[PDB]
């Protein structure tokens, strides 16, 4: 539905939608921009990520509320309330899966294949891992192991590139490590791997802070604090 709008106008409206906290609109504008077929700049990649992270974040939070109600409904001593809780959880789940499939579809057609610089390629592979991770959070069926492995594989390729091509303080590299560590802890039942990754990432970033300007130091230390927050929660 965005095919008739100029790329630049879509980007401008995505920024307006962000200011207005209209994240569904923001995501639709950024999807339209991606579908123009040109590569995205750093700023545009960030707009795409912000938009869909906010959309899927609302869906995930709602899914967790509904899943908890459904879980309580199926305890001993609970009174039968009918199919409605399951049905509504399923509705939200299907919408969430649709958003994840949309993002994964943009990455596959054709953002990843055209991304040659480390900053773009790592960013997109991180995103692929993230949206498979969100699919894994709700998965229960025959493909759940394959969904988890798809997240793992995308994160691993991103990690391999990031370690070769980026400094240990690079914010994309740090955010990738943060999210892969969460994957290990929450999805892959590997809390020790999660802790080891967070600690190694934190320590290697600490040792590289001396190379940075004040502004880059601020950027890197902010994400390092997220790593520390998780280490404090997990240990």
């Amino acid at each position: 539905a965005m095919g008739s709008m100029e790329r630049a106008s879509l980007i401008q409206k995505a920024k307006l939608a962000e200011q207005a906290e209209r994240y569904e609109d923001m995501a639709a504008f950024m999807k339209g921009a991606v579908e123009k077929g040109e590569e995205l700049s750093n700023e545009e990649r960030n707009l795409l990520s912000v938009a869909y992270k906010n959309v899927v974040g609302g869906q995930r939070a709602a899914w967790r509320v509904l899943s908890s109600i459904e879980q309580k409904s199926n305890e001993e001593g609970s009174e039968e309330k009918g199919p409605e809780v399951r049905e509504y959880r399923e509705k939200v789940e299907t919408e969430l899966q649709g958003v994840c499939d949309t993002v994964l579809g943009l990455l596959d057609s054709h953002l990843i294949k055209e991304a040659g610089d480390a900053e773009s390629r790592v960013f997109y592979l991180k995103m692929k891992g993230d949206y498979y991770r969100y699919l894994a959070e709700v998965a229960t069926g025959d493909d759940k192991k394959r969904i988890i492995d798809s997240a793992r594989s995308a994160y691993q390729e991103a990690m391999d590139i990031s370690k070769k091509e980026m400094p240990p303080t690079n914010p994309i590299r740090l955010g990738l490590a943060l999210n892969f560590s969460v994957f290990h802890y929450e999805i892959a039942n590997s809390p020790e791997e999660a802790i080891s990754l967070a600690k190694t990432t934190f320590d290697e970033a600490m040792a590289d802070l001396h190379t940075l300007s004040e502004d880059s130091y601020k950027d890197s230390t902010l994400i390092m604090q997220l790593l520390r927050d998780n280490l404090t929660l997990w240990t």
Binding site: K53, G57, K126, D130, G175, L176, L178, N179, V182, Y185, E186, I223, L226, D229, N230, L233, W234
Partner: peptide, 7 residues
């Protein structure tokens, strides 16, 4: 206290 991911 929910664990942090990259927001």
């Amino acid at each position: 206290r929910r664990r942090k991911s990259c927001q």
